[PDB]
Design a protein around this ligand. Structure first.
Ligand SMILES: CCc1c(C(=O)Nc2cccc(OCC(N)=O)c2)[nH]c(C)c1C(C)=O
Length: 126
């Protein structure tokens, strides 16, 4: 079975709309989403569909860009570090679960290199 997906809505969680979070949606997410290697990362790992009965035995902090997109679009975050953590979690999960040099790892590595360059350019808070 798949787990419930990560939370994307919680009215009890205080929220901010900030220029750094706006950058994360408008620049970081947009650049990553349209990348040729993005599709495996655009939704939670569907362990049923992929016949990976062990995925959620190994990965206990799942994350994906579909979830990040929802979090950004629905103003889930307080700060940019929260969002950056979600991207990092997504990449780390892929590296933990998969063999080095697997296609999925090569794809994650490509996205991560692009991610790091965009994050290095994160604007100062207004
Ligand atoms: C290698 C299996 C794997 C995928 C993958 O194949 N995803 C996928 C599969 C079907 C459709 C889809 O999305 C369809 C869409 N983008 O609409 C995405 N993604 C990750 C992160 C991993 C692992 C194990 O780390």
């Amino acid at each position: 079975m798949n787990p419930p997906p990560p939370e994307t809505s919680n009215p009890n969680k205080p929220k901010r709309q900030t220029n750094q979070l706006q950058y994360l949606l408008r620049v970081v997410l947009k650049t990553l989403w349209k990348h040729q290697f993005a599709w495996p990362f655009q939704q939670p790992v569907d362990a049923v569909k992929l016949n990976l009965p062990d995925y959620y035995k190994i990965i206990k902090t799942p994350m994906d860009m579909g979830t990040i997109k929802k979090r950004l679009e629905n103003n889930y975050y307080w700060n940019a570090q929260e969002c950056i953590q979600d991207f990092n979690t997504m990449f780390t999960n892929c590296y933990i679960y998969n063999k080095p040099g697997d296609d999925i790892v090569l794809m994650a590595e490509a996205l991560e290199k692009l991610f790091l360059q965009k994050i290095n350019e994160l604007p100062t808070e207004e």
